[PDB]
Design a protein around this ligand. Structure first.
Ligand SMILES: *[C@@H]1O[C@H](CO)[C@@H](O[C@@H]2O[C@H](CO)[C@@H](O[C@@H]3O[C@H](CO)[C@@H](O)[C@H](O[C@H]4O[C@H](CO)[C@@H](O)[C@H](O)[C@@H]4O[C@H]4O[C@H](CO)[C@@H](O)[C@H](O)[C@@H]4O)[C@@H]3O)[C@H](O)[C@H]2NC(C)=O)[C@H](O)[C@H]1NC(C)=O
Ligand SMILES: Cc1cc2nc3c(=O)[nH]c(=O)nc-3n(C[C@H](O)[C@H](O)[C@H](O)COP(=O)(O)OP(=O)(O)OC[C@H]3O[C@@H](n4cnc5c(N)ncnc54)[C@H](O)[C@@H]3O)c2cc1C
Ligand SMILES: *[C@@H]1O[C@H](CO)[C@@H](O)[C@H](O)[C@H]1NC(C)=O
Ligand SMILES: *[C@@H]1O[C@H](CO)[C@@H](O)[C@H](O)[C@H]1NC(C)=O
Ligand SMILES: *[C@@H]1O[C@H](CO)[C@@H](O)[C@H](O)[C@H]1NC(C)=O
Ligand SMILES: [Cl-]
Length: 581
């Protein structure tokens, strides 16, 4: 069985050499491990802090149990700094175990807007990283099931041209067995009355309007976590080894040559009892966006101003840990009538003007005139180091909004007994950072600061989007099922205006846990940490291959893109393997 195959004893790899070491057995780590070990000549060692959780039971396997796992050993629960917006510490839910956050996520499977991925090539200089190519890889990774009559009647629409059916990640409609709630179609009707589209397939490249979507689960409804999809079918490969229960602390570097070279990693759980393992080809960091950048800093790769005070010698100076981009989420929940009973989720990917409504003109005026001021302010807060380069990101977002009308906010609807919306501004302008606060990796002492709501448009956009969810919950066809609001409920007057919502939101939000950008894939001159093959600048044999690298957020759930990203980087790694013989 798979459990018996896992390594737990450090002595089983201490001092040994393998071709590739992957730090982190999460979404990108396991996808990459599977792709690389297809060649029997290539030995891979995945080092994961957690262990196998896929067969534990409903708390992991049933998507409807979402959230029950929070606070447990399968949740890293990274704590942020005391946030300036509300003087409180927030918790960043992040999966701890083989499969990473795919063990604890909502399972939502959607793709971003074509123009967003295209800009990774045209604005962020990543040759080959455009919608056509990334989408091709995403379809390659996908194994989707079309909806049946019951699911179609509920509101599903599936364009076969936009989905892979021969891939690895099992995806299809969530179906608990009971009737689907008529509230999903009621929401579609409510937005149709406003001229908003409905039933677009959110995997086709223009996510806009209200639609249902596939989920990452098998037909029997078992969660398609990355370990179940990429490791379980392949664990008997002799060349694939997985060490659990250990943290990679830092990358071992040789500076005896021209350019520093990653020769292995140090791992363990506490200072003073560590172990080294070596890589003949490369070290690949896939510990997640909150951690890969710290592994770099502990190794001497990061900003001298950060490393020197901690006693760490700066081997390669790069803006590691900056450009952190996570979203803010708030909730609107209402009681429903029994007529609205049934299962079902849907989401409104709302454009900038749909989000702001009659405040659209004023919001556009800010978007048009405040970009330089915002960039200077974010740099002064330490969210980024180069103002001009940040301004380019902001103008890219403006171009997405004004020239491509991409979705700006997401209003995610859960039913199953209530009408509940989790709402988030998809494109935050704030930029945060993560930096280590000690030289010892095993102390796990770091400052993770997303700087939520420190940009004024992010506060206005979140407030407008959440106000919209309240509005639509009692608009048009939705009025029928409305049986009273419970959240905010008594906590915010029902007729509250936009200003009132902006005062309420800082005290009633949670991180969205979609953090990206801490090792941004963009040119060094634009503040990047990795090139278009995910290679860390100035270091040989070292890559960052996880959610740390996307240089922008996107109007979608990220799994479809991260699986594609891992497969694309895997190909680049294999091309270099052939060049290093
Ligand atoms: C997060 O926490 C930090 C603190 O850790 C908060 O930052 C501090 O915020 C306070 C204000 O809340 C600020 O203190 C003021 O500093 C001013 C000097 O720069 C003072 O002039 C001011 O004094 C007035 O208000 C006091 C408090 O009521 C009175 O005791 C004092 O006598 C002064 O009173 C005059 O002004 C008030 C109107 O404010 C008026 O009613 C009176 O009639 C009179 O005219 C404060 O002491 C700190 O400087 C901030 N920073 C620090 C490091 O302490 C931050 O705001 C918090 N964030 C959130 C979101 O809550
Ligand atoms: C609560 C929540 C809900 C989400 N909902 C959705 C959704 O509905 N749809 C969607 O598409 N996406 C969703 N996501 C996001 C998606 O799951 C993540 O973006 C994705 O898993 C990130 O992949 P990754 O490879 O970068 O990191 P991860 O998958 O987080 O994997 C990193 C791995 O590194 C391990 N690790 C950490 N530190 C170390 C160390 N020092 N050494 C060794 N191993 C280490 C971790 O335990 C983990 O297994 C959600 C995420 C969260 C947290
Ligand atoms: C399905 O998707 C393909 C590719 O995007 C597109 O050409 C086609 O028009 C779509 N069909 C429908 C009915 O939307
Ligand atoms: C959004 O509103 C602004 C300001 O009224 C307008 O200029 C712009 O064209 C609108 N865009 C769309 C897609 O309606
Ligand atoms: C700052 O960013 C801009 C825009 O990408 C770039 O032209 C410039 O070279 C960067 N500055 C430095 C000092 O690298
Ligand atoms: Cl299946």
């Amino acid at each position: 069985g798979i459990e018996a195959s896992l390594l737990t004893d450090p002595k089983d790899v201490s001092g040994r050499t393998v071709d590739y070491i992957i730090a982190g057995g999460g979404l990108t780590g396991l996808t990459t491990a599977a792709r690389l070990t297809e060649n029997p000549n290539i030995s891979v060692l995945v080092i994961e802090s957690g262990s196998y959780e896929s067969d534990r039971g409903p708390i992991i396997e049933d998507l409807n149990a979402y959230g029950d796992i929070f606070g447990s050993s399968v949740d890293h629960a990274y704590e942020t700094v005391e946030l300036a917006t509300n003087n409180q510490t927030a918790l960043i839910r992040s999966g701890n175990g083989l499969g990473g956050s795919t063990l604890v996520n909502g399972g939502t499977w959607t793709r971003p807007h074509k123009a967003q991925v295209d800009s990774w090539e045209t604005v962020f200089g990543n040759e080959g990283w455009n919608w056509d190519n990334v989408a091709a890889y995403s379809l390659q990774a996908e194994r989707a099931r079309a909806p049946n009559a019951k699911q179609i009647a509920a509101g599903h629409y599936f364009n076969a041209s936009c989905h892979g059916v021969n891939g690895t990640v099992h995806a299809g409609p969530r179906d608990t067995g009971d009737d689907y709630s008529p509230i999903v179609k009621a929401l579609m009707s409510a937005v149709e009355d406003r001229g908003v589209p409905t039933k677009k397939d959110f995997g086709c490249g223009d996510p806009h309007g209200v639609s249902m979507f596939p989920n990452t689960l098998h037909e029997d409804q078992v969660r398609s976590d990355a370990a179940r999809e990429w490791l379980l079918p392949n664990y008997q490969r002799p060349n694939l080894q997985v060490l659990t229960g250990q943290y990679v602390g830092k990358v071992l570097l040789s500076q005896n040559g021209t350019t520093p070279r990653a020769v292995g990693v140090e791992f363990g759980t506490h200072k003073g009892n560590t172990h080294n393992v070596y890589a003949k080809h490369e070290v690949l960091l896939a510990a997640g966006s909150a951690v890969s950048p710290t592994i770099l800093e502990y190794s001497g790769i990061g900003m001298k101003s950060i490393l020197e005070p901690l006693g760490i010698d700066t081997v390669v100076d790069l803006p590691v840990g900056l450009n952190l981009q996570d979203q803010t989420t708030a909730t609107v929940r209402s009681r429903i009538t029994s007529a609205g009973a049934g299962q079902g989720q849907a989401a409104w990917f709302a454009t900038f003007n749909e989000t702001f409504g009659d405040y659209s003109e004023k919001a556009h005026e800010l978007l048009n005139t405040k970009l330089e001021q915002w960039a200077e302010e974010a740099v002064a807060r330490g969210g980024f180091h180069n103002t001009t380069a940040l301004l380019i990101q902001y103008e890219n977002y403006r171009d997405w909004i004004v020239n491509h009308n991409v979705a700006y906010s997401e209003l995610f609807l859960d039913t199953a007994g209530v009408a509940s919306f989790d709402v988030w501004d998809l494109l935050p302008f704030t930029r945060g950072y993560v930096h280590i606060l000690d030289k010892d990796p095993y102390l796990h002492h770091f400052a993770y600061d997303p700087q939520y709501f420190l940009n004024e448009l992010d506060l206005l956009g979140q407030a407008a989007a959440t106000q919209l969810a309240r509005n639509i919950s009692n608009s048009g066809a939705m009025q029928t099922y409305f049986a009273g609001e419970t959240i905010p409920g008594d906590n915010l007057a029902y007729d509250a205006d936009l200003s009132a919502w902006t005062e309420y939101i800082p005290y009633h939000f949670r991180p969205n846990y979609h953090g990206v950008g801490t090792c941004s894939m963009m040119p060094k001159e634009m503040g990047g940490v990795v090139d278009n093959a995910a290679r860390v600048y100035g270091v040989q044999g070292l890559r960052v291959i996880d959610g740390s690298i996307p240089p922008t957020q996107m109007s979608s759930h990220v799994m479809t893109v991260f699986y594609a990203m891992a497969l694309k980087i895997s190909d680049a790694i294999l091309e270099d393997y052939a060049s290093m013989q």
